[PDB]
Amino acid sequence: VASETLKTKKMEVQIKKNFPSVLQYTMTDGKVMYGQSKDVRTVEINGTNIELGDDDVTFKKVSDTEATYTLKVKDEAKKIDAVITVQITVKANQLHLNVTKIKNNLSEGIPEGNGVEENAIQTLSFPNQSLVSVRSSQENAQFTGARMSSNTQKPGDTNFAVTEDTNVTDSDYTYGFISGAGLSAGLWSNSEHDGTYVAAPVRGGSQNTRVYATTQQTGDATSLGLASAPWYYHRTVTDSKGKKYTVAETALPQMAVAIAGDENEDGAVNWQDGAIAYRDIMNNPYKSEEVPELVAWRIAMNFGSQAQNPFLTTLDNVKKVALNTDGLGQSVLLKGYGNEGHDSGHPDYGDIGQRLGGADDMNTMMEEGSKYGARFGVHVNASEMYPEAKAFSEDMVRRNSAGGLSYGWNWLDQGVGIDGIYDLASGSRVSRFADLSKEVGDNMDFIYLDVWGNLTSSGSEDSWETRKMSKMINDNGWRMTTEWGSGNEYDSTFQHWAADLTYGGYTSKGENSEVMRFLRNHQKDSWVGDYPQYGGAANAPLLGGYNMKDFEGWQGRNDYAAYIKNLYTHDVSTKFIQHFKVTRWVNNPLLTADNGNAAAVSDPNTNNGNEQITLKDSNGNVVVVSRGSNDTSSAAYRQRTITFNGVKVASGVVSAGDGSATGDESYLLPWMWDSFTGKLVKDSEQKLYHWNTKGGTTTWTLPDSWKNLSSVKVYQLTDQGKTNEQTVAVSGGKVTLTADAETPYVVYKGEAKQIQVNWSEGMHVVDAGFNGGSNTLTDNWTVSGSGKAEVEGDNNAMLRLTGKVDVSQRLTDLKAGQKYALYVGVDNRSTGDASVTVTSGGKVLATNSTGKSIAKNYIKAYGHNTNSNTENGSSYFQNMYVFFTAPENGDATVTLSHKSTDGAHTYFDDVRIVENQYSGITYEKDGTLKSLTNGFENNAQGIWPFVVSGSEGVEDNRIHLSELHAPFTRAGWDVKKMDDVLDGTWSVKVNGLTQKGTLVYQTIPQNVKFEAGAKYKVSFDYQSGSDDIYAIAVGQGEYSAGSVKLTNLKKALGETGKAEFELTGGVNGDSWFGIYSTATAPDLQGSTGNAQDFGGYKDFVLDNLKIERIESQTRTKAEAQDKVKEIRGKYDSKRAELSDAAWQQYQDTLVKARVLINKNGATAEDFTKAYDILVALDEYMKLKDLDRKLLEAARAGQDDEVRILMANGADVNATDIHGHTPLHLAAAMGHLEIVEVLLKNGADVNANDWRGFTPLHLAALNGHLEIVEVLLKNGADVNATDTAGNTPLHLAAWFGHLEIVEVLLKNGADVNAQDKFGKTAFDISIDNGNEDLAEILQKLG
Ligand SMILES: [Mn+2]
Ligand SMILES: [Mn+2]
Ligand SMILES: [Mn+2]
Ligand SMILES: [Mn+2]
């Protein structure tokens, strides 16, 4: 066989001239490794194997390190005619085989827009190429392979001896290493092939197998050789609509081997030796070099327009974690960074959440946080989208075989699957990442790709697709991170279901492979950590494993202390270990002869034959992690010792990662690296992290570079940073440390200076979140008053006020003459008012206040929800707003204050100053509300003036600000029957909250304040899917069922409806209105499946709210005096006959009104307010259900009972659930003996009900000739169009009566009137099926 030789200082490779093949590798020491010793010249194209002849291969030795081959690959029958150019290069102990050019003589290339390239070279391989091989005739001939396993009970590895009986053909592995005759080598390929896996719950590149092992006979022996799995070149793919595409290669085909001897000098030559060498040739995930620095992983969540975590709050929280960890690196995943929050706006990647502070605040957060070693990344979705998203198009939609939508999940809106192949082949996805790139430049660290591999985008989402997905992302300078534990083996540096050990159970975790973890532990957080509950891989892995907890809303996670406790429990040590590369791993108790690991490295001379891992860095430092015993029944199985350069730095049992049992582990870990590129720090910066689980006193040997010190400085780490400096003596290079249980300490060689932190940079105040300790109330905020101001809270610190106290601070960096919103979270337990006020040189620009807070916080992702115990096991925190214009003066100041000097507490947190164009609030001269309008077009956050109620308890509330994207968000697109937006770009949307029997959302006095005794006209535009599904609720104080007044609303589905009612301020000023979910079931109109959800039958949209004060009539001292006489006469003698709690509320109002009336020097305004309050008291004192019994009396036919209730004092225009007044309920039943008497008492004859009609329509429909004539006399609207369109003339002819038409037309009924349907007066009688009504219609009409 004509050959030639390639040379390096480490080896000489003999290569065949007739094909790109190796005969042998001969190391400097003479050890030889075989290649393909047999004449094998196979080239596979598009699945057809073609054997290449002598005339088909051209050879050129370029240099001593390189050869070029030109392969004439042809098959006329199978439409194959290509020219493959192969390069072979040698470098040190490595060999590379690259396909550098692929010329297709049957194609002019891919037509524009990734059209189908006919006879395209889709796949390429060299079957049984045997680039590297071992024979059964060689000393210790063995194979080690690795496949994907997300199951802690099932290893992904295999280890067996290569014996005469070894028979395999194209056996695929993610990794394969062969060893024998004192040399080991693994094969690397960039192949995107999907194959054999052990356990994986998803696709998304989990099944990437790039090595193919095959046996053949080499005379005497059986030879096992490794080849690369097939490569994809110009692959043809099909979208959900059947449209076919040809997409170019992700990269050209590449492969390599690295020949190793006894690399770890352990006297054995096995896969571990090849693995060490493999690192020099293997692909490395982009930005994997930074993984060891990411000590503090967490998610900062935003959801449902709430803006729970604006970008500049996230920066303050980075500073808090930096102080508590002494500056260890961080990785913050922004979940809901975009659009309205999490699972909103998918897949508009470039739409940075405007309510969070937009791209401007994101960049500030990223640039500034980077100074503290914090990395930032965003949660994106490439599988599901919502109609709101500007990317939503018919082409983007995934469709099924039937041609219908591939529906996603319904929550705030209905998600629709994205056609993944379209999104890739059209260039759509890559332009959306480009949109984000434009916003973030080079500031953002990573992308977090959710769900990829679950098969929502297509039934494929394979390694080829995943590779192209990771490329798009890496090309914009972003490190790849994803959801599923097994997902994206090639490019992911983090799996959420690997790092958050709680999800999915033991079958769905990180990578369970010794081979994979050996090779890449330092490059990823994608392994199995401690979660003993799962067993196997999760029972005290020696290398640790990232254990992720969160404190910023993700899944209601708000516990800061547990977050930090967990960092020091598992993640400091895990990260320390990641600064070293595994070089040896013996006695793995997971690997047995029974699970396919007979040949696994089992040394009885290291660690008593129990598990041990040795790791080293590029500087020759050695870490040794040892398991106390390989018996899971022994207490020692969970005992680990860690040594750094032969010195004990950690010992014990970690507290169980599943939170089941605390341990005893104590450590003194040398942290020698900066939190940036991880370069070594200087001696004055060299530090040790100390942790003692049980607490107590432990003695330790300091690292060698500390042996000559006489003392050390120890600081206890808090949210304030380095505290309680201790000087500890050093005797014989040893220290004694007393530590409290689960408490962090940092040890320095000398005195260390405090990390400089300037709280709330860019937030227009200093320390907006109250994280500066007790000290902020001295240094940043200014306290004045008799009362008490304290920074209370061991978790999320708040401001706690007691008595008369003013906490104030100057506003900075405001834009002169620009409109700003200033909101603060407030929880008021005091009856005395709690205020927010913006002033300029003594002038009050804006003020707002709250009495006792009347609504518990149900926002899951918010820091102070009712599950957070602010005081007495609850949280009533809700954002209180002020709107002002920044002064030209340039001198503005905020004041948080408490008015009454009672004992009760007021809680404030998160002072937010944000540019805002809202101007819908118009006041009176006295400062109270004249009117409020909201089109929801400028909401700083949330559904303001409404606040979310408890129909779903503490949840990621299915209520948010809906966005316009026509035609997709409008009624009529697909199965959609309701508009998301009624007016402008925004509305308040409720999704599927039917049959709750409780309040959905409501106004609160701190947003809308309804003055005791004052009348208001509440009006809004709305859309409700079904009749009686939602209701307007009218209450006083904290909501209690049976204490609220409901008005069930009519179906407005695709047509904006209108609602308006009169609200009278409750005697205690805690009156409000909102939306209530009734008990009646939706009218799904025969919808099946997701159609029930998307349709809108279960939904409620509200827009254009108008609240107007109705100016009352001016009263005299007299009118009011007389009203006290009247009110007391009716309810005095009835002393505790009804209630005792309601007697206190009655007596307190009579005192209030008397004060106003009798104040020496009172005025008409005092007299008319005392009278209006009294009128409202008389209404509260109608506790005996008279109003609900009067309506019950006109119904049944009780002509005698209406007489009793009316005179007694029941409401003249009392309404039921359908807005029927006593006139409506009696005009329809045919009771003239009830209507004649009710009309006399000034009962609203022109009052509109549920269907928008007056008792004219109800007296005409049921066939009452006596009630219609007496109604028109009393001033009934003959020309009255209802919400349904029908006037009293129309409905009179529909049932079957004529007589009414003549009595209506006489009074002035419009015959030319046309309803909403399109029917007129005469047109109705044609389809009636009778000419008995039509005859008198044609005579006059
Ligand atoms: Mn070795
Ligand atoms: Mn706070
Ligand atoms: Mn609007
Ligand atoms: Mn939405």
Side-chain angles (χ1 to χ4, degrees), residues 768-771 796-798 864 909-910:
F770 300 95
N771 310 120
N796 189 335
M798 293 168 271
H864 303 294
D909 202 8
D910 304 298

Short mmCIF file of all heavy atoms in Angstrom, two decimals, residues 768-771 796-798 864 909-910, ligand 2:
data_model
loop_
_atom_site.label_atom_id
_atom_site.label_comp_id
_atom_site.label_asym_id
_atom_site.label_seq_id
_atom_site.Cartn_x
_atom_site.Cartn_y
_atom_site.Cartn_z
N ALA A 768 -33.65 53.00 47.42
CA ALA A 768 -35.05 52.90 47.08
C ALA A 768 -35.71 51.62 47.66
O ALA A 768 -36.92 51.63 47.93
CB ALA A 768 -35.19 52.93 45.57
N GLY A 769 -34.90 50.55 47.83
CA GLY A 769 -35.33 49.24 48.32
C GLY A 769 -35.06 48.98 49.79
O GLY A 769 -35.39 47.90 50.30
N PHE A 770 -34.43 49.97 50.48
CA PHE A 770 -34.10 49.96 51.92
C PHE A 770 -33.16 48.78 52.28
O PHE A 770 -33.46 47.98 53.17
CB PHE A 770 -35.38 50.03 52.81
CG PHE A 770 -36.19 51.28 52.57
CD1 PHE A 770 -37.25 51.28 51.68
CD2 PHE A 770 -35.86 52.48 53.20
CE1 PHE A 770 -37.98 52.46 51.42
CE2 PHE A 770 -36.57 53.65 52.94
CZ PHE A 770 -37.61 53.64 52.04
N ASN A 771 -32.01 48.71 51.58
CA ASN A 771 -30.95 47.69 51.70
C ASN A 771 -29.62 48.28 52.32
O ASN A 771 -28.60 47.59 52.39
CB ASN A 771 -30.65 47.06 50.30
CG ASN A 771 -31.82 46.55 49.48
OD1 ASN A 771 -32.04 47.03 48.35
ND2 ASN A 771 -32.58 45.57 50.00
N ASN A 796 -36.57 40.74 52.66
CA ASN A 796 -36.61 41.94 51.85
C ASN A 796 -36.89 43.12 52.79
O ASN A 796 -38.03 43.25 53.26
CB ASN A 796 -37.74 41.81 50.82
CG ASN A 796 -37.76 42.88 49.76
OD1 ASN A 796 -37.26 44.01 49.94
ND2 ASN A 796 -38.37 42.56 48.63
N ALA A 797 -35.87 43.97 53.06
CA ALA A 797 -36.05 45.09 54.00
C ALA A 797 -37.02 46.11 53.50
O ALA A 797 -37.09 46.38 52.29
CB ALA A 797 -34.74 45.74 54.38
N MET A 798 -37.79 46.67 54.44
CA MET A 798 -38.85 47.63 54.22
C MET A 798 -38.67 48.76 55.18
O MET A 798 -37.96 48.64 56.17
CB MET A 798 -40.17 46.99 54.62
CG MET A 798 -40.60 45.88 53.78
SD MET A 798 -41.97 45.04 54.59
CE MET A 798 -41.13 43.88 55.56
N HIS A 864 -43.51 41.28 48.20
CA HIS A 864 -44.38 41.43 49.36
C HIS A 864 -45.78 40.90 49.14
O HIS A 864 -46.72 41.56 49.52
CB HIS A 864 -44.40 42.90 49.83
CG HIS A 864 -43.05 43.44 50.16
ND1 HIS A 864 -42.30 42.94 51.22
CD2 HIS A 864 -42.34 44.43 49.55
CE1 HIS A 864 -41.17 43.64 51.22
NE2 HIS A 864 -41.18 44.57 50.26
N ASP A 909 -42.06 50.21 50.74
CA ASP A 909 -40.91 49.66 50.05
C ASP A 909 -40.91 50.04 48.57
O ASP A 909 -41.97 50.25 47.97
CB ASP A 909 -40.77 48.13 50.23
CG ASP A 909 -39.35 47.60 50.00
OD1 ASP A 909 -38.43 48.44 49.85
OD2 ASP A 909 -39.17 46.37 50.01
N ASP A 910 -39.70 50.10 47.97
CA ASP A 910 -39.43 50.28 46.55
C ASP A 910 -39.98 51.60 45.99
O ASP A 910 -40.94 51.63 45.20
CB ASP A 910 -39.92 49.07 45.74
CG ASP A 910 -39.35 47.73 46.18
OD1 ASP A 910 -38.12 47.55 46.11
OD2 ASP A 910 -40.14 46.85 46.57
MN MN B 2 -36.72 46.00 49.91
#
